[PDB]
Amino acid sequence: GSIKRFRLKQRLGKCRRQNRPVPHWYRLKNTKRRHWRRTKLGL
Amino acid sequence: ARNPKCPRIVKSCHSKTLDKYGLIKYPLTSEKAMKKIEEINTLVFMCDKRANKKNIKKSVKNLFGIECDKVNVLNTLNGDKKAYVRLSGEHDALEVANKIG
Amino acid sequence: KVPPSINQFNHTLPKSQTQDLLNFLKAYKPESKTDKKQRLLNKLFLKYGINHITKLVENKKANLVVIANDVSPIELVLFLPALCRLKEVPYCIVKDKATLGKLVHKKTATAVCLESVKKEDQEKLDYFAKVC
Amino acid sequence: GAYKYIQEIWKKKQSDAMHFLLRVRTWEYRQLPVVHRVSKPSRPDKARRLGYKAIQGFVIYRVRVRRGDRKKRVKKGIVHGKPKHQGVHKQKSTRNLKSVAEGKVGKSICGNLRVLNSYWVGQDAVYKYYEVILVDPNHNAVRNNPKINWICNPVHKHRELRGLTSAGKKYRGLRVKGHLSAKSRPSIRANWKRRQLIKLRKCR
Amino acid sequence: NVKAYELRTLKKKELLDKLDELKKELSGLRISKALGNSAKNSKIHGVRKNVARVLTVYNQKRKMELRQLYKNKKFKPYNLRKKLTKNKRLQLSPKQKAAMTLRQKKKVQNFPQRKYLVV
RNA sequence: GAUGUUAGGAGGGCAAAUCCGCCGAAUUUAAGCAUAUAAUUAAGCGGAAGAAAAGAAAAUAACUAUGAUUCCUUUAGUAACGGCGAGUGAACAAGGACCAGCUCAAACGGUUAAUCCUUCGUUUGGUGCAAACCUUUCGACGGAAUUGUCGUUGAAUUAUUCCA
RNA sequence: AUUGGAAUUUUUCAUGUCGAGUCGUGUUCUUUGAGAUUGGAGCACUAAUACGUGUGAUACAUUUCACAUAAAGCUAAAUAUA
RNA sequence: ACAGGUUGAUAUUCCUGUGCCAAUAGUAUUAUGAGUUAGAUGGUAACAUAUAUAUAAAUGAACUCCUUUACAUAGGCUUUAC
């Protein structure tokens, strides 16, 4: 928990990077997101 | 003991092993990194996750001509290494700072 | 307790006399590569192979057959002294496999035959046959 | 001449000399490792006749198999199957002990080698000991040789586990021909599927 | 920017010097991109592609040199040898498949089939 | 029989619709149920291929006989099997698709294994821009094998006639 | 232009040969169309050599006659494919 | 491996100060104490002894024998520290 594993830490950082919202410019040429309290990573 | 007729493969391509360019990715741009440069002769660098301290130290000295008293490292949430590098007291971080921007 | 047919293959000719017989047989050694080349270019022997030797014994074309007991299957030549006795033809049971192989220019031999020789050396072979 | 003599000598079996030699050899076989290399077959005549060729790529392996059948697999007591169905003490199933021996070598040592066939050699009342004729498909002499060469084709991977060996031919009944093979001849699977099959035309 | 044939013209020292130059320039762009500057950012793609061209040309030349070095003598190193299907590699030769016993050779030569007509 | 990071090679695993092996049930049916039934089905463990396996007589017939295999049409819901109850159940012939033969092994060949392979090499062809493949006979030097490789398919001998 | 092979055809002469703990039988368990045992398998006993022995669907003895040549091996095609 | 300091958010880990630990190759120099003209000493004894920048250095192989690591519960008595 408080101490961590390198593989777990990397995947969690990935999941956080994926989470952040879509570029607005893409809509000028957002289906999935997680919220930490109500949705856990299931790992 | 072994002495084969030919090695398994001798593949003559350029190396895929990590290099100075990519081992050190970029200096940090934060107020904190500015404060470290200003007060304690410390240059703060983003580096590859699979990098190791000696290799970072070697890379910095190759790209910047500069020697490191200690290199302290961290593996980040953004999936890279973040290296705090204390420069030796003969040569000043400010001069290097002027060179990098 | 050992059946006679199994048993007989611990018995041989006298050792020095066996050496003398082997050396006499040696003289009639088969050809080599170089001899074959010579035979083509220019212008009796020791017989091996248990299937060939048995054929020789059937046809009475052998004179003396020398059998090893140091072969791993002895069964494959176990019948041969019995057959040779019935065919009334000289056979000899002899200790060393490797030496018989040397006489035929090989690493090993099961049996080896000297099937009839020139009259002047015939008499010595007749003495060997008498002993056998 | 020689092989015919050895054949007939071996054919009687119940001779003192044969019994002596068999007991000693079986004794030695009882000592040895489960699957092990031999340089040459113990009986040349039987081996040559069962397709042994005295060439480099032809290899002999001697194999140990335990005697008798065996209980069907269960929880502790017998499974809860019908009053007809008891696998208790025995089942006496399809693979003959020669085929079983070929399977053990066929998985353990073969892969590089391919099984050709196997012959009886000797037995007591707790083990049978068999010798298996095996062949390498890779080596140049066998690839060069027009004889046997067919075995180099990739369909001969695990012949015994397809039951193509003399032992396999036996329990699949391929030795049997005529009306004694009527429900079995194209294969037991094949014959049943043909008989089962209901075939309809478009206009019937 | 740089085009393959011009690189193929170069000697190995010269090509590597160009490769090193591009890396240093690429790094300068990368540092610039990392800074708050937006001056040269789009050029980095072009440089990365230029580096790629250099490496492909150098590697092709090196591979050809390795092939030249192991011209004939039966065996190239394993993965410089023919990569083909495992099955195709395993497969018996047609030459060996074609070959046959002396009695078979006699049968073939003496008795081939022939074509015909009728009245 | 050991031992070797000796030199050269191979297998492992995956994928599975059809294919080939094993190993291998029950819900169900009988208006109950036990034999029978589901069914030599499902699941399990293995092996293969673009098809697989099968295949050149230890065959069918009792005719005026047929004559490797596979497949279809059929025999046939029949002979037969069955608490002869429920229920199960072929093969041969005939019409066709389509059809292809063969070799080990014994036997035979000893004034000579006439065999086989690796390593080293070497040249008569042919492509391709290039990579590179493809033909090609000739020698070594190692080994292997006679506890049996190669040739031969009764043996000679005559005339004929073809092929390399 | 050599070397070699093969097929018929005469006449003599050689009439040799053909796969065993396998078949078979008994017994057991399984299986099927197999029925006083069809195939498999375990175990027990265990063969004959080509004028032999394996077949000719009811156990047997005694005898015909026809047909085959087990216990080694391979092989394209039609055929199948959720 | 501690004390003090410091950031918008970390600190036994950043900073200042002070230390502590393990390794630390070869060769040549040097300084440090030993021993020599092949291995120190005292103390009856229990035992003690190198204060070199630095308590460093007090011959020893095979083969052996110990010891630390390394241990329950309960009850009081007692000493230190906060």
UniProtKB/TrEMBL annotation, chain A:
Xref: InterPro entries: Ribosomal_eL39, Ribosomal_eL39_CS, Ribosomal_eL39_dom_sf
Gene Ontology molecular-function annotations: structural constituent of ribosome
Keyword Ribonucleoprotein belongs to the record: yes
Keyword Ribosomal protein recorded: yes
One Pfam entry name: Ribosomal_L39
UniProt keyword list: Ribonucleoprotein, Ribosomal protein
PROSITE patterns: RIBOSOMAL_L39E
Cellular component terms (Gene Ontology): cytosolic large ribosomal subunit
GO biological process: translation
Protein family according to the UniProt entry: Belongs to the eukaryotic ribosomal protein eL39 family.
Protein known as: 60S ribosomal protein L39
Organism of origin: Plasmodium falciparum (isolate 3D7)
Source species taxonomy: Eukaryota, Sar, Alveolata, Apicomplexa, Aconoidasida
From TrEMBL, chain C:
Domain Ribosomal protein eL8/eL30/eS12/Gadd45: start-end pairs: 44-122
Known role: Component of the ribosome.
Similarity annotation: Belongs to the eukaryotic ribosomal protein eL8 family.
Organism this protein belongs to: Plasmodium falciparum (isolate 3D7)
Record protein name field: 60S ribosomal protein L7a
Domain of life, per lineage: Eukaryota
From TrEMBL, chain D:
One Gene Ontology cellular component: cytosolic large ribosomal subunit
One Gene Ontology biological process: cytoplasmic translation
Gene3D superfamilies: Ribosomal protein l15e
The protein's name in its UniProt record: Ribosomal protein L15
Ribonucleoprotein as UniProt keyword: yes
UniProt KW keywords: Metal-binding, Ribonucleoprotein, Ribosomal protein
Alphabetical list of PROSITE patterns matching this protein: RIBOSOMAL_L15E (PS01194)
Pfam families given in the database record: Ribosomal_L15e
Recorded GO MF terms: RNA binding; structural constituent of ribosome
Domain of life where this protein originates: Eukaryota
Family, per entry: Belongs to the eukaryotic ribosomal protein eL15 family.
Binding residue positions for Mg(2+): 80
Cross-referenced NCBIfam families: PRK04243.1 (NF003269)
UniProtKB/TrEMBL annotation, chain E:
Pfam families, alphabetized: Ribosomal_L29 (PF00831)
Keywords (A to Z) from UniProt: Coiled coil, Ribonucleoprotein, Ribosomal protein
Record flagged with keyword Cell inner membrane: no
Residue runs in coiled coils: 5-32
One Gene Ontology cellular component annotation held by this UniProt entry: cytosolic large ribosomal subunit
GO molecular function: mRNA binding; structural constituent of ribosome
InterPro entries the record matches: Ribosomal_uL29, Ribosomal_uL29_euk, Ribosomal_uL29_sf
A GO BP entry: maturation of LSU-rRNA from tricistronic rRNA transcript (SSU-rRNA, 5.8S rRNA, LSU-rRNA)
Protein family (similarity comment): Belongs to the universal ribosomal protein uL29 family.
Stored HAMAP family: Ribosomal_uL29
Name assigned to this protein: 60S ribosomal protein L35, putative
Species per Swiss-Prot/TrEMBL record: Plasmodium falciparum (isolate 3D7)
Lineage, highest ranks first: Eukaryota, Sar, Alveolata, Apicomplexa, Aconoidasida
